[PDB]
Design an enzyme around this catalytic site. Sequence first.
Site, PDB file in Angstrom:
ATOM      1  N   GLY A  49       0.847  -1.182   0.000  1.00  0.00           N
ATOM      2  CA  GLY A  49       0.000   0.000   0.000  1.00  0.00           C
ATOM      3  C   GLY A  49       0.879   1.226   0.000  1.00  0.00           C
ATOM      4  O   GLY A  49       2.105   1.106  -0.063  1.00  0.00           O
ATOM      5  N   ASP A  63     -11.471   3.649   8.761  1.00  0.00           N
ATOM      6  CA  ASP A  63     -11.117   3.009   7.502  1.00  0.00           C
ATOM      7  C   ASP A  63     -11.849   1.709   7.368  1.00  0.00           C
ATOM      8  O   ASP A  63     -11.303   0.717   6.883  1.00  0.00           O
ATOM      9  CB  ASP A  63      -9.599   2.880   7.303  1.00  0.00           C
ATOM     10  CG  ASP A  63      -9.178   2.683   5.851  1.00  0.00           C
ATOM     11  OD1 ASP A  63      -9.942   3.104   4.942  1.00  0.00           O
ATOM     12  OD2 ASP A  63      -8.012   2.273   5.629  1.00  0.00           O
TER      13      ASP A  63
HETATM   14  N1  ATP Z   1      -3.182 -10.467  10.048  1.00  0.00           N
HETATM   15  C1  ATP Z   1      -3.232 -10.568   8.717  1.00  0.00           C
HETATM   16  N2  ATP Z   1      -3.344 -11.799   8.164  1.00  0.00           N
HETATM   17  C2  ATP Z   1      -3.324 -11.907   6.828  1.00  0.00           C
HETATM   18  N3  ATP Z   1      -3.229 -10.941   5.910  1.00  0.00           N
HETATM   19  C3  ATP Z   1      -3.123  -9.737   6.487  1.00  0.00           C
HETATM   20  C4  ATP Z   1      -3.121  -9.466   7.846  1.00  0.00           C
HETATM   21  N4  ATP Z   1      -3.011  -8.104   8.074  1.00  0.00           N
HETATM   22  C5  ATP Z   1      -2.937  -7.592   6.869  1.00  0.00           C
HETATM   23  N5  ATP Z   1      -2.993  -8.519   5.865  1.00  0.00           N
HETATM   24  C6  ATP Z   1      -2.890  -8.262   4.433  1.00  0.00           C
HETATM   25  O1  ATP Z   1      -2.101  -7.104   4.244  1.00  0.00           O
HETATM   26  C7  ATP Z   1      -2.635  -6.298   3.170  1.00  0.00           C
HETATM   27  C8  ATP Z   1      -2.826  -4.863   3.613  1.00  0.00           C
HETATM   28  O2  ATP Z   1      -2.547  -4.670   5.020  1.00  0.00           O
HETATM   29  P1  ATP Z   1      -2.924  -3.300   5.812  1.00  0.00           P
HETATM   30  O3  ATP Z   1      -4.324  -2.952   5.527  1.00  0.00           O
HETATM   31  O4  ATP Z   1      -2.769  -3.507   7.325  1.00  0.00           O
HETATM   32  O5  ATP Z   1      -1.983  -2.096   5.366  1.00  0.00           O
HETATM   33  P2  ATP Z   1      -2.135  -0.893   4.335  1.00  0.00           P
HETATM   34  O6  ATP Z   1      -0.970   0.010   4.486  1.00  0.00           O
HETATM   35  O7  ATP Z   1      -3.426  -0.131   4.597  1.00  0.00           O
HETATM   36  O8  ATP Z   1      -2.185  -1.459   2.845  1.00  0.00           O
HETATM   37  P3  ATP Z   1      -3.183  -1.343   1.607  1.00  0.00           P
HETATM   38  O9  ATP Z   1      -3.237   0.119   1.174  1.00  0.00           O
HETATM   39  O10 ATP Z   1      -2.678  -2.254   0.537  1.00  0.00           O
HETATM   40  O11 ATP Z   1      -4.555  -1.736   2.088  1.00  0.00           O
HETATM   41  C9  ATP Z   1      -3.865  -7.033   2.632  1.00  0.00           C
HETATM   42  O12 ATP Z   1      -3.536  -7.744   1.446  1.00  0.00           O
HETATM   43  C10 ATP Z   1      -4.239  -7.995   3.764  1.00  0.00           C
HETATM   44  O13 ATP Z   1      -4.748  -9.220   3.242  1.00  0.00           O
END
Ligand code: ATP
EC number: 2.7.11.1
Length: 325
Positions: free
Chosen positions: A46, A152
């Site tokens: 992300g 979010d």
């Molecule tokens: N505990 C978990 N088990 C499995 N997959 C996870 C877990 N936590 C996060 N993910 C995976 O990590 C990714 C995004 O994580 P997260 O939402 O915490 O961060 P982000 O910075 O907001 O990223 P993004 O903008 O891609 O959503 C997703 O593909 C999700 O499936």
Amino acid sequence: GPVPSRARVYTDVNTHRPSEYWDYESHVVEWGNQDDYQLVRKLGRGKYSEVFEAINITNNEKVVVKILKPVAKIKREIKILENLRGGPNIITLADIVKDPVSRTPALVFEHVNNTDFKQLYQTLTDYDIRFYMYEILKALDYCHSMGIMHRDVKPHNVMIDHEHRKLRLIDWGLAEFYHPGQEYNVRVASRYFKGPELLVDYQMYDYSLDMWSLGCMLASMIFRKEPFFHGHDNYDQLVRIAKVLGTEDLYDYIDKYNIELDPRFNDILGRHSRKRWERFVHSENQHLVSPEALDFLDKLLRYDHQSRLTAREAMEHPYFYTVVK
Ligand SMILES: Nc1ncnc2c1ncn2[C@@H]1O[C@H](COP(=O)(O)OP(=O)(O)OP(=O)(O)O)[C@@H](O)[C@H]1O
Ligand SMILES: NCc1ccc(OC(F)(F)F)c(Cl)c1
């Protein structure tokens, strides 16, 4: 100027807890050992992090490592995760390490065997939507009761292991502590899930923002339309909402809070009647819709953030009577 607003629930939870609970800037992080973890595969990227499947080699358990991009507000996410740890359906923060490459903190979480979203959305029965929505509500009432708003809520931030019927609310990177009278940044939540308060630049919002986002998820699922409100941009997002909820109640809302719409709206908003929820029912979604689903949706998708059901009120709704508890 705009009329002030306050949450109708959990208003004073942060003034009554010790300052160390909400003052995330004064929190001291006790670092774990990066040594303990072996990265297996990159799961995603992300704008704020890279997420990896990893193995904790000290206890031989599957973990998930979230390496934060340098973009500060890291203490807030840590503090919230520690505050909420052990809460129902709240992802568990297992550790905090310093990545020797990025030089940034890496959050270590418990692993959830997340069923693919478009695979699950397509197979959910009426019972499964009710069941999982009730599980999300447990997470939201808990964080709200703890003086935190998620900001979010969206399907990508709800991990589900369908085989084990296990749900976890993840990605607390935009979560904040609710302090009555505080003005917050409206640049939160994904476009399709943004509450009207955000879209009209009303800053004194609260936990009820999460309840609008939950309503958008519910509408998308019961009506089989992803996303339900499919705005091209943040302005068209409000027009999409107004085409369903009507412009008269939108004007009553902005009038109550003495909010003025951006003049850009003059050429695009128009006049729209409120639409009956029954209009979105068709032969391909009828098996997911009931009078209780419509009544419940109607009480979440309200312009006035103060008029939405709270998470605890939502769990009392007839829509959930069928769910085994
Ligand atoms: N505990 C978990 N088990 C499995 N997959 C996870 C877990 N936590 C996060 N993910 C995976 O990590 C990714 C995004 O994580 P997260 O939402 O915490 O961060 P982000 O910075 O907001 O990223 P993004 O903008 O891609 O959503 C997703 O593909 C999700 O499936
Ligand atoms: N991100 C996976 C995923 C799968 C189904 C979902 O809807 C449900 F909650 F109703 F089950 C959600 Cl919110 C999220």
